[PDB]
Protein: polysialic acid capsule biosynthesis protein SiaC
Amino acid sequence: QNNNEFKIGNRSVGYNHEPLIICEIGINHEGSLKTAFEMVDAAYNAGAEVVKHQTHIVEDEMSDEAKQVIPGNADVSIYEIMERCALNEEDEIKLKEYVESKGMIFISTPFSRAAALRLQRMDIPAYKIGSGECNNYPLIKLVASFGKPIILSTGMNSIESIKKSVEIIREAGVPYALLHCTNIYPTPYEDVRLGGMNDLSEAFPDAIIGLSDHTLDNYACLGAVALGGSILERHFTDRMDRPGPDIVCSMNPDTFKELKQGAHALKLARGGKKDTIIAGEKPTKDFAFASVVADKDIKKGELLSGDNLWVKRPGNGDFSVNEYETLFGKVAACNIRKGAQIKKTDIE
Amino acid sequence: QNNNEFKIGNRSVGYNHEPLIICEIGINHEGSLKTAFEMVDAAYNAGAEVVKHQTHIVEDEMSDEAKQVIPGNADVSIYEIMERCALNEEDEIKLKEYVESKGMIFISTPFSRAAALRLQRMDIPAYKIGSGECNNYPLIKLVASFGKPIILSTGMNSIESIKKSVEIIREAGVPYALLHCTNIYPTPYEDVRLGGMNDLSEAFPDAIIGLSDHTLDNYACLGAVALGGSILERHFTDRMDRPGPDIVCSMNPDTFKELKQGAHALKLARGGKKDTIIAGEKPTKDFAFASVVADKDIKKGELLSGDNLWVKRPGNGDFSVNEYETLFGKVAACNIRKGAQIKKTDIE
Ligand SMILES: [Mn+2]
Ligand SMILES: [Mn+2]
Structure:
């Protein structure tokens, strides 16, 4: 598709690089640092390159009205969920060091101004902005002024609303990625609309394109890689029997490994051009292509025609099936045996 | 992508229909009708809709030169392989009835004029033309005059060489499909070039598009579905420990089931548009979007500014984050408490 790219630390991202899978532990640790470490361990052992957290500072993230609104995948207020799962600054700093001590990249999604400022102090290599904040222009202006690349999910937002955020990002001069997304825990296959990735790349040609996903399996993400996706995102848990509203659509070590393997295979198979010559096909072309042969015993002097000529494998004959009709009208320079390949010396 | 379509018997094929998986037993039965039936049974029990055979009449398919050429995946001449695996007319008729007795569709790839005529007598619902015969124009003219839809693989052929075959097909007035393909047993991921499907659809807008595959797994085909493929083809065997040159890249009942499941999921997830409104996202939009709030206690009379205003979740406030800046300059109609959502009655 394109040659756009940028780096998250020492990791290059873009169409011409290996797709990057972001393992979002998010709020899956339910506020326990111990659980968070067990999930970081599972990600590390599964071969993850990036672990993504969610930075929640409830007071700066939402007003009192949030204590009265229930999310689609929960039974209590969003305020109660975030307050229950939120890690204080101290613990989050410990989580970042822990992930890095494992040789992995740590990034986190900020949901507020205070969160963004905390992450800037921690000096993360890139900032993720969720679909909920894709239209929070003032917050995006703040994050872009940090000087690091931005990864923006675009669920729940139209191309036009997104253009305002991208304009702000360009103005700041930092590279960015746009992840197509559908924000429903979980998301049915029918609502995915992988075509959205194309719409985004067409509208924003300088953007790295990817997919953030909330379906129950790897199919959507694998399709995203086939279409040209460079960044894949799925919630991640060490085991499926963990409690939590996001566990339902989370991938686990086993499913992460499958996704990584499939993404690699599709990275290799995607794109390319129809007319490209594949050397490995040579031996097949040599025996599978047809050559012109006598379909009847032809006496010297007789004229060749579509009545006494036909075509058969292999393709080493003097005349290819492509020249079949050009032999019509020619005269046999000698007797031609039925079934024999017509050779140049066979025509006067 | 498009609304092109046609029927293979009572089965509709096209972008707006469920992708069709063709199970190619081909020469996997090694010339044994008993083995062929065991493979047909395995396909049936796995849920296959179509079983594809290969019709070999060695004398009309190749000249004596073929007894001296070895294919890439074999150690003996192509003539010896075909002669060893070929089913006579009697047995092939029995195979067709057997497949149909199982409620499945039977089609077969012809490799010669004699093969095409035999299949016409059997009256198959559609004709498959392999990549080896994609450039065999005289043979294609013969098959097109039969009046049934044609499925043409295009491996080893450039867009220009393919246009000659398509012209012949249109001239005959029958619907057709173009399958991208790479003819190497097996095919590495890197040689797949899924982009070839796009090239084909762009060049031939009236063609149903699909993929014929020879890789070691389902990844290539799943990627093809994500891109818009309507027909998938893989060699098929009842078990992987069967002898034969094509068994290496064949799928088996278990892998067929996985492909069918994935193709279904990707049929649902592919395409669509970014701007489409997903009803299921409503509850998320209501709590995730931000509203304007007082960032400072504002005394009546004071002017609102980016210094004493900010934005926070949820999205039920009188002023959305989109209107943040429009409040700059307004005058507080009364005292505004820090953290409170700015309401219409809050400004004079
Ligand atoms: Mn998510
Ligand atoms: Mn094949």
Notes: The longest helix of chain A spans residues 253-269. Chain A has two domains: 5-275, 276-348. The first strand of chain A starts at residue 6 and ends at 8.
